[PDB]
Design a protein around this ligand. Sequence first.
Ligand SMILES: [Ca+2]
Ligand SMILES: [Ca+2]
Ligand SMILES: [Ca+2]
Ligand SMILES: [Ca+2]
Ligand SMILES: [Ca+2]
Ligand SMILES: [Ca+2]
Lengths: 215, 215
Amino acid sequence: DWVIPPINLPENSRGPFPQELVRIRSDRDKNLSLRYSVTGPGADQPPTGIFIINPISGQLSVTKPLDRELIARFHLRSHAVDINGNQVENPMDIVINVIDMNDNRPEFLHQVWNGSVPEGSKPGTYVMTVTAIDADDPNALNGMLRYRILSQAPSTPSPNMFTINNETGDIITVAAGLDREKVQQYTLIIQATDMEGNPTYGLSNTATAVITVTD
Amino acid sequence: DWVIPPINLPENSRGPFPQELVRIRSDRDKNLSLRYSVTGPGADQPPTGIFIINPISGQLSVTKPLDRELIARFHLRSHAVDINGNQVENPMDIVINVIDMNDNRPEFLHQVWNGSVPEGSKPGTYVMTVTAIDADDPNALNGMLRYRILSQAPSTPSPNMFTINNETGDIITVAAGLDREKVQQYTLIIQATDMEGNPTYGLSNTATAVITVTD
Ligand SMILES: [Ca+2]
Ligand SMILES: [Ca+2]
Ligand SMILES: [Ca+2]
Ligand SMILES: [Ca+2]
Ligand SMILES: [Ca+2]
Ligand SMILES: [Ca+2]
């Protein structure tokens, strides 16, 4: 069979609805009067009525806005029948990929994280790991996160005693001079931002990490 | 066989080129490496190079702006061949319609039209008929004319002694007091305007109508 290629379709479709996707037809038109129809999950199986087809023209249409997070792919099959109901073509697979859109922001597993670190710890010492998640596709830019520290109270002896690992969320000491008798609890605001942490196009969320220095 | 439907295309395309039309493929690409091509007047036969297809991806494209008044329809055929060169599908017929654009203004059959009317004639008299053509599609708005008079000479006894049949181009008298000893010859300027005469968008052209009154 000469098949039609996969239909890639951005989620949160703008409208107006029902928007057309593709017109299909069987070259048997010229002989006899036909009737088109589509079957499978999306059409005549739950969730029904999302994809519809014109019995006459073969114009396949989508009715509602899609959501990759709910259904990321639809496998449909189109058919062709004559006036007294007989199959005139081998049902064609129509694959519909719901393309991902950056429609939900990062989310830390907790609002406050807690960590510890012994005083006078050599630069390079590991303290704790914050992690966040994103309901977008991890393979798409929409789902790829990057962490950064925004603030650091108090700001002594250095205004950045710590560094966050860009990708992994692991926090490390860069500075020396951790002295409990001077600063007991550093408090960081970490920001996880998506799309490789693109400032303009990236969504963000923040959390807090409280690093107690111990004796 | 399931086939792709006709492709519609406005003439006088803007670009940039090559602008793509439709991606086709054969479901044999899963088994073996394929190679697509196109044939016919428009592809490999004269005029050559207007339409092309990507050997690997099957993306069909247009290279140049089209012109309905030169070629209004293209009959192509797509092929799919295996590595060694054998056909792997029945060539698919591809129909391409060049949709009309209003790209040329109306044209009168004569610059100067002559006509007659007996003196003192009744209001309602046919005197002559003027007709203009249009190289655009008669059935589209781009080729549907509306005639009308722009000015008269002289403007006595009335400033508008005549009127034009809005659609047909039959000129009809709307005033009496025609007299060879007062005004021997009138001379009108008629204006054919396309697109149901739409003053804003429609293109126009003018011609003359010389109406002699007789004893
Ligand atoms: Ca969504
Ligand atoms: Ca996101
Ligand atoms: Ca998404
Ligand atoms: Ca043209
Ligand atoms: Ca035209
Ligand atoms: Ca025209």
